[PDB]
Amino acid sequence: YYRYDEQLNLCLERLSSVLQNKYVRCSVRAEVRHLRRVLCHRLMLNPQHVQLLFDNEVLPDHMTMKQIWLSRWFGKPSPLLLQYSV
């Protein structure tokens, strides 16, 4: 199932603690909330003080990675750059 979904490459930057392993790969079906939770797990943060943004605008919880790519990164070279805040 998810293992065999198309994969997207991401890069995550903090927006003025930090993520060391900032290159991420996941399923095109993964949603913002999912990425936010795994992010929070690794950085030992509560998922309530952490937001995912693109172009300095907060991304809705349920938007899939594919939807970010299509809407904001169409045809652009890998990886898709996102930002996170605390």
Partner 1 sequence: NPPGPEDVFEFEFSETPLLPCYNIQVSVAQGPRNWLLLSDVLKKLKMSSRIFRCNFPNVEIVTIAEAEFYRQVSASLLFSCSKDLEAFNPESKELLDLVEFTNEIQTLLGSSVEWLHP
List residues near partner 1 by CB under 8 A: 1-4, 6-9, 11, 20-30, 34-35, 37-38, 41-42, 46-48, 69-70, 74-79
Beta carbon of residue 5, minimum distance to partner 1 (angstroms, whole number): 8
Of 24 and 82, the one with the shorter C-beta distance to partner 1 is: 24
Strand partners, 8: 26
Rounded Cα gap, residues 38 and 34, in angstroms: 6
Minimal distance, residue 43 CB to partner 1, in Å: 11
Q: Please classify residue 81 by burial: count the beta carbons closer than 10 Å to its beta carbon, then call 0-12 exposed, 13-18 middle and 19+ buried.
A: middle
